[PDB]
Amino acid sequence: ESADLRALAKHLYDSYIKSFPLTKAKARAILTGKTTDKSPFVIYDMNSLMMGEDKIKFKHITPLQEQSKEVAIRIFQGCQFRSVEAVQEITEYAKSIPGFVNLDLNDQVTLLKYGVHEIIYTMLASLMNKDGVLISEGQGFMTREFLKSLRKPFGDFMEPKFEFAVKFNALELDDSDLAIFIAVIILSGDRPGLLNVKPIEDIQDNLLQALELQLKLNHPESSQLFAKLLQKMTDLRQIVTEHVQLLQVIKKTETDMSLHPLLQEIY
Amino acid sequence: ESADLRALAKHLYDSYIKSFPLTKAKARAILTGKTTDKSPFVIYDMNSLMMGEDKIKFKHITPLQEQSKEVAIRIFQGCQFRSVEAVQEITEYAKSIPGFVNLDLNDQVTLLKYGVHEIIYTMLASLMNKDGVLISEGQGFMTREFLKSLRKPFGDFMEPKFEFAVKFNALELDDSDLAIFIAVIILSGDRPGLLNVKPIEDIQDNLLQALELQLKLNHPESSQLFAKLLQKMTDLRQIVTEHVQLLQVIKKTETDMSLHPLLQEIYK
Ligand SMILES: Oc1ccc(/C=C/c2cc(O)cc(O)c2)cc1
């Protein structure tokens, strides 16, 4: 019944607004969108990020550059922190989804183990555009060119993300849309190791239904947007796989150091 | 007007038929061991394969395998010819797709080139069941275990396909549905090297409305089948990957074995 889908939709939307600080309406005003009044400290050069964290309240590293731990390394360890953060936000948005907790815990844990990854790149596109990506709650904006002028490893790290974001943003979705789109992702059912897929698919079915009417009523003119949207979810599955390749090569760059232990444990 | 999408649906199901000598419906009638209208010869070991030459059309080696092109090679050079065959059949079906042969000529090629294997594995599932796959216009049937037990390199090669088939076939689609879904695969838009995407995405963003209505009518119960079907194109692209690379391997350990010219102008 239509009434339930608009309900489920509104439920998830209000829940999504509570769970995620920096939203897209927001990030879109701060970014290219004018809403000029507060604008975000820019980072384009190696002197720009140098001591840059001045304003910007960073947790982990400060403006130190002189053969003391490479800039590239300290920029990647940053994303990871944010990652660890987002995973928590998401783990909570998950509980908010109708029926999620009523499932087998083992299953709730697996759905997150694999889902947390696609949702992160999905939302990172909310804080990105062809020129750069928003950072530090929105007090930042690290240019795209600066990111590509990074060490040999890290040069392709974020490029395959700006490409996806550019395409994904062309769909022009809003937080009310991504709310449902993101639920659908989590409640996949084809994730490895699940134990009772029926339940997991009954909800996604219900979530998919809601996503459909939502895009209809919310994009009356965008012909076949539902379909194109579900397609972009394949590019996500690929961008996530390719991400562990340039990551595995990292496992073969740092290492043997006894002052890491309680850190490599966190990540 | 849902009357044009239905007329477009008819159009496609028709060429699909004219382009593929073996349909999924012909394939299932042979597999479900029940319509002994013609049954297949089941190859499952060496002796059986040796006999397969007589009972079925195998212009391949009979006696010795290892020494004179080991059995593993015999099977591959054959499965190869089957594919060049397949590509031409799909090249035909492409041309039949409205708007296709009007797009820039390079884009046509570009679409075929990447569109091919995706379609070949989607169709290869129509000939597979939890235990094997039809071969030679359906005259024969090769066992999943037989294959899964071949020389180190060739051994695995078909095992990511059988997996795809079981889950994919689960959707229980029929030939008229695979026709619209197959067109949607070629007329994509996010393919490497394309010159103009708008006129191409225009076609897909119309075939899709066709696949949607087709599925709501054809499967009034299978809910979210439209959405579930599309999500299949992901497990698809992953297969090509395993292939192309597993192909790199043989290309080096088997330097006396060739490859069909047409099957080269497609891998990148
Ligand atoms: O000695 C041999 C003689 C013939 C073959 C044929 C293999 C083959 C595999 C397919 O998927 C489709 C097909 O139509 C044929 C393999 C070994």
Swiss-Prot record, chain A:
Where is the short sequence motif 9aaTAD located?
Answer: 261-267
On tissue specificity, the annotation reads: Highest expression in adipose tissue. Lower in skeletal muscle, spleen, heart and liver. Also detectable in placenta, lung and ovary.
Where in the cell is the protein located? Nucleus; Cytoplasm
One GO BP on record is: positive regulation of miRNA transcription
Primary localization = nucleus
Activity regulation as described:
PDPK1 activates its transcriptional activity independently of its kinase activity.
A GO cellular component annotation here is: intracellular membrane-bounded organelle
What does the entry report about post-translational modification of this chain? Phosphorylated in basal conditions and dephosphorylated when treated with the ligand. May be dephosphorylated by PPP5C. Ubiquitinated by E3 ubiquitin-protein ligase complex containing FBXO9; leading to proteasomal degradation. Ubiquitinated at Lys-18 by TRIM55 leading to proteasomal degradation. Ubiquitinated by E3 ubiquitin-protein ligase STUB1/CHIP; leading to proteasomal degradation.
NR LBD domain boundaries: 4-267
The effect of R82H is:
In colon cancer; sporadic; somatic mutation; partial loss of ligand-binding
The answer to whether UniProt assigns keyword Nucleus to this entry is yes
Question: What molecular function terms (GO) are annotated for this protein?
Answer: alpha-actinin binding; arachidonate binding; chromatin binding; DNA binding; DNA binding domain binding; DNA-binding transcription activator activity, RNA polymerase II-specific; DNA-binding transcription factor activity; DNA-binding transcription factor activity, RNA polymerase II-specific
Q: What keywords is this UniProt entry annotated with?
A: Activator, Biological rhythms, Cytoplasm, Diabetes mellitus, Disease variant, DNA-binding, Glycoprotein, Isopeptide bond, Metal-binding, Nucleus, Obesity, Phosphoprotein, Receptor, Transcription, Transcription regulation, Ubl conjugation, Zinc, Zinc-finger
Q: Give the domain of life.
A: Eukaryota
The record lists rosiglitazone as bound by Q80, F81, R82, S83, H117, H243, Y267
* Disease listed for this protein: Defects in PPARG can lead to type 2 insulin-resistant diabetes and hyptertension. PPARG mutations may be associated with colon cancer. Obesity: A condition characterized by an increase of body weight beyond the limitation of skeletal and physical requirements, as the result of excessive accumulation of body fat.
Domains: what does the record tell us?
Answer: The 9aaTAD motif is a transactivation domain present in a large number of yeast and animal transcription factors.
The protein's name in its UniProt record: Peroxisome proliferator-activated receptor gamma
Recite the lineage of the species. Eukaryota, Metazoa, Chordata, Craniata, Vertebrata
Q: What part of the full protein is here?
A: 235 to 501 of 505
